[PDB]
Design a protein around this ligand. Structure first.
Ligand SMILES: *C(=O)[C@@H](NC(=O)Cc1ccccc1)[C@@H]1N[C@@H](C(=O)O)C(C)(C)S1
Length: 261
C-alpha cells in the first residue's frame, strides 16, 4: 500500500479532489498527487502577498515600518486584527503578521493595495520563477474556488517549490526570509490541518486556506526533530458549492506522506 494508494483511497473516500506535494529537502525527492493540477489557493495566496512586500523592504529600509490607516470601510468578512485598529493605524509589518498568523482579509487587501493590485503579486511570483501562480482578485472573492475557474489558482507542486525558495531558499534575503518564517511558525489558524497530522514535537510554519466548494488548504514547512526540512502543500476541494471544509483530510494527507520521516 504505497503512499499513492493511500492518497487515492483518501481522495475517493472523501468524495473530493486531493492535491498533494511534498518536497524532502534532504535529497530533494518528492511525493506527488495531482500536484500538476490547478486548485484555488484561497488564503494560502496571502504568503505571496507578504513575500512581495518583504522583497521590496530589502530595498527600502523604511517600508515595513510605514503606517497604514484602518477605517471601518476597510473591513470585510474576516478582519480579526484590522478591526481592533479601526480609527488607528497598522504598519506594513503588522499587516503582514495579521494576514498570515490570523489570515486577516482586510490585512491581505491592504497588502495588495500597497503593492498595486493582484497583478503585482503575480509579477512578483513570475520574478520568483513561479510561472503557475496567479492572483486575480482580492479578499474575499479570491475565495470562490469555483471548479475549473482559472482565477487565483496554482498547482501543489508550484506552490511547494515556491514556498521552499521563500522559506529555505534563494527567494528572500536572509533577514526577510527569517521574518517570513517567523510569521509562518506563528500562525494560529492551522491547528486542525497539517499540524494535526504530524509529531507534536516537530516545528511547523503554515498558512491555511478556506473557500467555497468546501475548499480546504494548507501549505507548510516542517522541521523534523532529526531530519532536513520538508515542504508540504495540501489542497482539497469538492463538487458541491456548499460542501463543508475537511481539514481532517489535510491532516490525513500529512500523516500519510510524513510517514518514514
Ligand atoms: C482565506 O482563505 C480566507 N478565506 C475566506 O475569507 C473565506 C472563508 C471560508 C470559510 C469560512 C470563512 C471565510 C481566510 N483564511 C481562512 C483559513 O485560513 O482557513 C479563514 C477561515 C481563516 S478566512
Amino acid at each position: 500500500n504505497s503512499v499513492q494508494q493511500q492518497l487515492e483511497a483518501l481522495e475517493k473516500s472523501s468524495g473530493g479532489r486531493l492535491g498533494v506535494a511534498l518536497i524532502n529537502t534532504a535529497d530533494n525527492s518528492q511525493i506527488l498527487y495531482r500536484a500538476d493540477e490547478r486548485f484555488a489557493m484561497c488564503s494560502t495566496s496571502k504568503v505571496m502577498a507578504a513575500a512581495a512586500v518583504l522583497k521590496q523592504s530589502e530595498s527600502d529600509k523604511h517600508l515595513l515600518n510605514q503606517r497604514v490607516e484602518i477605517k471601518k470601510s476597510d473591513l470585510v468578512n474576516y478582519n480579526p486584527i484590522a478591526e481592533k485598529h479601526v480609527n488607528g493605524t497598522m504598519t506594513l509589518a503588522e499587516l503582514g503578521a495579521a494576514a498570515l498568523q490570523y489570515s486577516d482579509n482586510t490585512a491581505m487587501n491592504k497588502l495588495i493595495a500597497h503593492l498595486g493590485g493582484p497583478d503585482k503579486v503575480t509579477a512578483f511570483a513570475r520574478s520568483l520563477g513561479d510561472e503557475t501562480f496567479r492572483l486575480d482578485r482580492t479578499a474575499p472573492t479570491l475565495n470562490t474556488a469555483i471548479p475549473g475557474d482559472p482565477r487565483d489558482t496554482t498547482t501543489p507542486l508550484a506552490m511547494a517549490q515556491t514556498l521552499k525558495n521563500l522559506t529555505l531558499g534563494k527567494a528572500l534575503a536572509e533577514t526577510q526570509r527569517a521574518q517570513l518564517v517567523t510569521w509562518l511558525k506563528g500562525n494560529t489558524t492551522g491547528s486542525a490541518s497539517i499540524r494535526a497530522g504530524l509529531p507534536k514535537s516537530w516545528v511547523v510554519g503554515d498558512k491555511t486556506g478556506s473557500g467555497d466548494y468546501g475548499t480546504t488548504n494548507d501549505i507548510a514547512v516542517i522541521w523534523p526533530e532529526n531530519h532536513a526540512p520538508l515542504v508540504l502543500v495540501t489542497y482539497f476541494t469538492q463538487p458541491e458549492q456548499k460542501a463543508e471544509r475537511r481539514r481532517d483530510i489535510l491532516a490525513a494527507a500529512a500523516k500519510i506522506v510524513t510517514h518514514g520521516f
